[PDB]
Amino acid sequence: MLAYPDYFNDITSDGPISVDDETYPLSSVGMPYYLDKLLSAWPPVVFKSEGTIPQLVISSQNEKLSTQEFPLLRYDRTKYGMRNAIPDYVCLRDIRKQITSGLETSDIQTYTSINKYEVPPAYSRLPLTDNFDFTPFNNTEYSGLDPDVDNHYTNAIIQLYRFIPEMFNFVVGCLKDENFETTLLTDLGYLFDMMERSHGKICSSSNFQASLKSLTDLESLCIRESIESSESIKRNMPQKFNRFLLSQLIKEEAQTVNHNITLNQCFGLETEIRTECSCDHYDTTVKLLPSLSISGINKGQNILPYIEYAMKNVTQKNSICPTCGKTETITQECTVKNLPSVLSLELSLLDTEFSNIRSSKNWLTSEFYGSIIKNKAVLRSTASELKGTSHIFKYELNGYVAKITDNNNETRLVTYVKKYNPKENCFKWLMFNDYLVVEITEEEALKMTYPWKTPEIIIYCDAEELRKPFFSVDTYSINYDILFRDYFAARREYKLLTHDEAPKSGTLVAIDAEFVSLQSELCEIDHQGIRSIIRPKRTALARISIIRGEEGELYGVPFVDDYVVNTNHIEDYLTRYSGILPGDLDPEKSTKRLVRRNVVYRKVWLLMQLGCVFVGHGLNNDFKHININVPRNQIRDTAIYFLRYLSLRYLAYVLLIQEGNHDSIEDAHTALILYKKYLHLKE
Amino acid sequence: LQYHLYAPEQPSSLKSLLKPNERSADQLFIPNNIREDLTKKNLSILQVFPSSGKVIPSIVQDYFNLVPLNFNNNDFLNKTTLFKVFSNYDGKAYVLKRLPNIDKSMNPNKISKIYQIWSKINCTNLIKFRDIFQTTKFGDLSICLVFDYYPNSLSLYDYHFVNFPKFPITNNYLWIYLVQLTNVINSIHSQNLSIGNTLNWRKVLITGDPGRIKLSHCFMDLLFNSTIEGQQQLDYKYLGELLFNLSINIENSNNNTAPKEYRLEEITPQSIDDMRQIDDKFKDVLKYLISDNSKKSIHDLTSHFYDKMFMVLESSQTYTEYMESVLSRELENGRLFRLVNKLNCIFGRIESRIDINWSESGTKFPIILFYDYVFHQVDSNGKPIMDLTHVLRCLNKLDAGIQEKLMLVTPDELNCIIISYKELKDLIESTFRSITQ
Amino acid sequence: ERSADQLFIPNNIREDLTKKNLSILQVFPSSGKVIPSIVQDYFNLVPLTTLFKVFSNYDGKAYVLKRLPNIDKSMNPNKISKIYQIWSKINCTNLIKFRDIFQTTKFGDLSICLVFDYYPNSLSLYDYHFVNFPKFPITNNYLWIYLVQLTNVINSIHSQNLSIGNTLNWRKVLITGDPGRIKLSHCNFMDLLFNDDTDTVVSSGGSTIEGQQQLDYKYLGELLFNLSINIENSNNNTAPKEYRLEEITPQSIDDMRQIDDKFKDVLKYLISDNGDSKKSIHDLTSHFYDKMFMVLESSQTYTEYMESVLSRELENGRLFRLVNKLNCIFGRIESRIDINWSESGTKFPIILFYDYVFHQVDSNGKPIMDLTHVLRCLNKLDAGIQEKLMLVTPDELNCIIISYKELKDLIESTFRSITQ
């Protein structure tokens, strides 16, 4: 009937014209008279897609198994997202330009905006950061983090974990012993010590990030698999990072002397997976997992059912078993036996679900009660609503990390957190975006209504355990051995400390350090004189030297003189400004070479903890690149107020000579003498 | 008879709000005014009305399918002088003007002479003059002229004050008018021929905006049963009449007030000096045109304004580039359309619909996946949306042979296929050919 | 071939333009950092090697980038600002527009880069007339046109008190579009950029701008001279001879063989220095006159031609929109397993109709695609005509009757439902 030629349409045409004919114009058949709007009329839609900057145990398929030679089948989170989605559009010019002070100082701390869609100033990108002192951004007593590291988003996550009492107290606790073999746990401990110690100004994650980057050179396979603007891609990474960090830390806490494995208890989830099929015979496994990843279908009122399903779920995936090679759809059922003291939630969802979540009111529950019955974990909002053993655990929201996409459609990460105040028996809510810290109201904290905000990571903790106080490392007795002995994994001379001198509060020591540049600062200049800094400078520690300050000048013997031997494939060694070998690399290096592994950092840190004052040509630059800050009490240095800074070699001749290549100990020594001059000079 | 429902322009506020990268649906395509004009042209040329053997000629000379244009007549008394015509040779139509009831047969030699002289001259902005001939089909012993058509052309008079919604007549345009008229004058005088004194508002038609001015009638007396130089200079005054008269009614034009017309006799230099809103250079030019001798030369007149001549050239060239751009884009749209037709032909086949994914075979799967990729678009946040410029990019890229690579994703989201556009074009064309035979 | 002034009419327009946008679209290079991935607002670089074709981020409008490969030290940003401010304002048809100048380290050497509007498949006069096969031999008319447009550039540049420089040679001025449209490129920005002192405050001695301003006249003379003289070398296939102000003598321009003596007078005016030159655009143009009418005439002619060819093609865009919308609505994954889109459902006629238009059966035995069928169906649907169509399920027992208007309303309703 309808087949060509039909009587309806084709009756006029004697033979078919092919679509590929250019001689035959499309105008050949005119439209008849129309009294109404055409379908071809296009609705008033804006088009944002063009000029988008590209790139920001089973195989094959289940039911897709009819294939040509072509397909390679790995997918989802790693690359893109939901099928054929259009990428959001970001314009670089608008991205790199915006901030000086923002032109605003006081109004920047306002977290609420009258417009629902508008992104508040606090969430907006903060300016990048000679030396500049940013006072107005943080009025709280809790430190913020510097945005400049290899990948800054991690900060958001770390700050969160900082407020988990168990986590913090444990990791800071592990500083008491050596534990040099564990990079991440220790470095994170020191970082924790920074954020804790300074009720005040900012701390940097640089050493942590460096160590992590060095480490990446089953979980390692996962994060490496996820691995390939420089900073741009949060695509699925932060979730994965959460898993990697947690799991790795558990792996490392094994290596500590006591084998404490407290994390294994605290974040630990016994996961029971049962596979039902043939040719696998039967297989049942149980494994401890740090975090649970949430997905789902409704089969809601609020977040809890998602959690419940995450804890007990049966899913069907098509697998090939190593037992017998039969490849078929297999059914796995996994349930978790226990409820941890602290649990971490990784949100991987269809964006539609994110929409539905934004639609719901108070979708995130401030607190909930939960217990296991049968083999099935159950979680409900109120004690009575569940009936059972009445052995129930109270879980309160400790904090969460949220992704923010502003109007320019660039992506940043921010942290929401809760802290206990023992007096008044109260809770306070805080937001951390990089070096910006704001005390905020609960109602704003829980509100999911905002369209830019998407939840990424959510951390829940036990009510009784959360209210336990935070403890600084000072309460524990600390191992000072590395100060008194030598660990080196050639320099002329130096003398290790003995038990007699007793460095303590008031003790005087001298220090200087020398650095090597891992990266050069690169600028781009458009019209109208705007300095765009792309690829920021990456600097690493090279040499550290500390000499005795007891009895005034006294002994000329160095407390420690150390080379750090770090290999990131340096661009330039700055040999002129500071003597560097090069080739300090561990295998071929003739010098006392120690993997920094906090150890030099440990010397300086135990020193500053004991409260011994530091001397130098200037403390700030050096300490800033050592990734440690010390109170002004220890701070005193030679350089004096002059029309910026003052140069030491210049001052030496004035104080009576000088040479082109200067050992660090020399600068430190001369510095110490200069301080001695400064005291007696008085008026 | 007319429809503005082809497509509504998007609201002005949106266009104002648009970011530089951001495009709107009309901007991808040909703007409405040009397409409407061209469409009206096509319709007006193409329209053919039925005819009677005895009321109107079946065939005349080399010409047929005659239809009268009843509306253009100054004759007022007798049936219309001018008719629309389709030529036998070449088509493209043309215009014909009838000259009825001639006293006595004029010799063919004279007609041949007139033809040779007026055919010899070729100038744009001067309506091309085609074959002239005498025929009996009217049985009035009638001699007729043939011109190029140049459809929907309005006289400057009709252009600004009446025919369309009234148009503002800014002096800038006046400059262009002056330049083009200067061109036709120079071109006709180059053949030493005399102008016709048809230079007044009427009979001077505009086409091809911005302002392409052309003279039509351009001398009819030579057909009929002072020296050359005298007339040749005399016309300067006529042009002056035109430009002055235009110049004075500008204010009347803006508020669409009724015009005043003035003859060259009424013109006073002081009155010219009196007028405002005009560039003193152009005023000086008008002064040159109206005043009596030092014979008036093309040299001096053109010598008055060099810069504005360059201005006119600039405008013309810019517009040319504009038109090229629009033409390129729409031709591209056509090709792309055909492509979409082939892609559509392969996709969604009824034979193919019994799997949850719609590919019948495994060979056809990648193209179908691609179809899903281009046409079935999902916004971020997970809501469906259809972009066009995306579609244009993918289709355009596919038409070419370029090696850019695509990650195509299955409807499971579990799986993917990696493919290069060259392989896609080859695959689509080969498959299409296979299906079609 | 040789023609009257139709001059801007190209031999084959469709081929040229299609090839042009095709040339615009192509990007080969990716992997290596020899050519970096992204520079400022610019990306998708392809070499033309110091010179690249680039797609901008901001505009999304393809442009070209000039690399300017090594720089002593950091450029005084104010100078760059000066260059941008000065040349961004100027607008000329025959001078390729200057959009953005910037300094970048992305090459891993210190490079300053310029960006110009794109004019694809454009060749230099050197290449166009003499070497590249087949070569169109310079006819006096074309020469006149060249002269007029370059003169335009002279007027436009000098009117803003800037000098064009030593770029007036033919190889640095390219043609855009095959037959007649000319454009020049670089304009010697090097003078303004690389100088420590230009304060643009003349002492009593006076400014140095005028001298260069005359120099431009001289250079124009050189270009036009070389082209005009090498004409015979062009007509027969042969290599050209090059000349310079130093080498150029009037006795020879008078000893020229095929040239209009008027052009000889023009060349003479341009090449010669006089005790008082005072060369103005006015005098030279006074030499010119009618040739302006020639270029304008050709321009209008080309406009008319393009309008003519465009007329046939204009309808297709609409069709594009229509098939695009229908395509949007038809095959969505969620729509695949819905009960509405099933054999008994509201949406079913859409599938049946689409099958009807696009999926044809010859003698019930194979597929065929008729174009006029597709256009007829689509046009009639767009118009929304009250006319009835009989569609089959096709489980062949029962059928559905539907009118094009109802199809139109239904389709738009569905589309609106999917969107928004």
UniProtKB/Swiss-Prot annotation, chain A:
Signal peptide bounds: none
Major place of localization?
A: cytoplasm
Linker as annotated region, ranges:
1-117
Q: What is the effect of changing residue 622 to A?
A: Abolishes nuclease activity
Cofactor note from UniProt? Binds 2 metal cations per subunit in the catalytic exonuclease domain.
The cofactors it requires, by name, are: a divalent metal cation
Exonuclease domain spans which residues? 509-675
Domain of life of the organism in this record? Eukaryota
Record note on what altering residue 514 to A does? Abolishes nuclease activity
The EC category is hydrolase
Residue ranges occupied by any USP domain in the UniProt entry:
118-463
Activity regulation note: Positively regulated by the regulatory subunit PAN3. Negatively regulated by PAB1-binding protein PBP1. Inhibited under stress conditions. Inhibition of deadenylation under stress increases mRNA stability, which may be a mechanism to retain the majority of the cytoplasmic pool of mRNAs for later reuse and recovery from stress.
Instruction: Tell me which family the UniProt entry assigns to this protein.
Output: Belongs to the peptidase C19 family. PAN2 subfamily.
What function does this protein fulfil?
A: Catalytic subunit of the poly(A)-nuclease (PAN) deadenylation complex, one of two cytoplasmic mRNA deadenylases involved in mRNA turnover. PAN specifically shortens poly(A) tails of RNA and the activity is stimulated by poly(A)-binding protein PAB1. PAN deadenylation is followed by rapid degradation of the shortened mRNA tails by the CCR4-NOT complex. Deadenylated mRNAs are then degraded by two alternative mechanisms, namely exosome-mediated 3'-5' exonucleolytic degradation, or deadenylation-dependent mRNA decaping by DCP1-DCP2 and subsequent 5'-3' exonucleolytic degradation by XRN1.
User: How are the domains described in the entry?
Assistant: Contains a pseudo-UCH domain. This ubiquitin C-terminal hydrolase (UCH)-like or ubiquitin specific protease (USP)-like domain is predicted to be catalytically inactive because it lacks the active site catalytic triad characteristic of thiol proteases, with residues at the equivalent structural positions that are incompatible with catalysis, and it cannot bind ubiquitin. It functions as a structural scaffold for intra- and intermolecular interactions in the complex. The linker, or PAN3 interaction domain (PID), between the WD40 repeats and the pseudo-UCH domain mediates interaction with PAN3.
The record's misc note reads:
Present with 1510 molecules/cell in log phase SD medium.
Q: What is this protein called?
A: PAN2-PAN3 deadenylation complex catalytic subunit PAN2
Q: What is the lineage of its organism?
A: Eukaryota, Fungi, Dikarya, Ascomycota, Saccharomycotina
Q: What range of the intact protein is shown? A: 340 to 1087 of 1115
Curated annotation (Swiss-Prot), chain C:
GO biological process assignments: DNA repair; mRNA processing; nuclear-transcribed mRNA poly(A) tail shortening; postreplication repair
Q: Which domain of life is it from?
A: Eukaryota
Q: Which residues carry this modification: Phosphoserine?
A: 3
Record has Kinase as a keyword: no
Q: Which cellular component terms (GO) are annotated to the entry?
A: cytoplasm; P-body; PAN complex
Task: Name the segments for region: Knob domain.
Answer: 329-420
UniProt similarity note: Belongs to the protein kinase superfamily. PAN3 family.
Protein name in the entry: PAN2-PAN3 deadenylation complex subunit PAN3
What is the covered span of the full protein? Answer: 250 to 679 of 679
